[PDB]
Amino acid sequence: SMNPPPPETSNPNKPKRQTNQLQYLLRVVLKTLWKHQFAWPFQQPVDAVKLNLPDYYKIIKTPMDMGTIKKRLENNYYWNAQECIQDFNTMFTNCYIYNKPGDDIVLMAEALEKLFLQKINELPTEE
């Protein structure tokens, strides 16, 4: 198939708040993963047309990427910090669903996920 529209990154029908957790998720978690040498395949939605991966969006029905997550944080899309953490988890899980052990892309996800866990370890306390 072709590509779906990217996930929504704003919600007009949802109140917005600033929290220590959410700001940390942008400025520490997202930012540190973003600058990693293996971040690039996860910085934007998988372009299945350009990459000639016709089955990607047949297999992956809940796509997620760090470009989307970054915009969601900047736009205050998330009310609860867990919403953001869930999106990271979905991104990694998609990679482990679609690909095979030892694939380049899988090793890249593994390094990012390792780093992600190190960073969310020091997430500020809620509320």
The window from 5-13, 19-27, 43-51, 118-126 that contacts ligand L28 (CB under 6 A) reads: 43-51
Q: Determine, following the binding rule CB under 6 A, whether residue 33 of this chain makes contact with ligand L28.
A: no
- Backbone Cα Rg of the chain: 15
Encoded tokens for 87? 């999106």
Determine the straight-line distance between the first and last CA of the chain, rounded to whole angstroms.
43
C-alpha triplet 65, 44, 8: angle, nearest 5°: 65
Q: How many residues bind ligand L28 (CB under 6 A)?
A: 12
CB of 85 to ligand L28, least distance (A): 18
**Gap between the Cα atoms of 71 and 29, Å rounded:** 14
Q: What mask of x and - would describe binding to ligand L28 in positions 80 to 119, judged by CB under 6 A?
A: ---------------x--xx-----x--------------
- Residues engaged in binding ligand L28 (CB under 6 A): 40-42, 44, 46-47, 50-51, 95, 98-99, 105
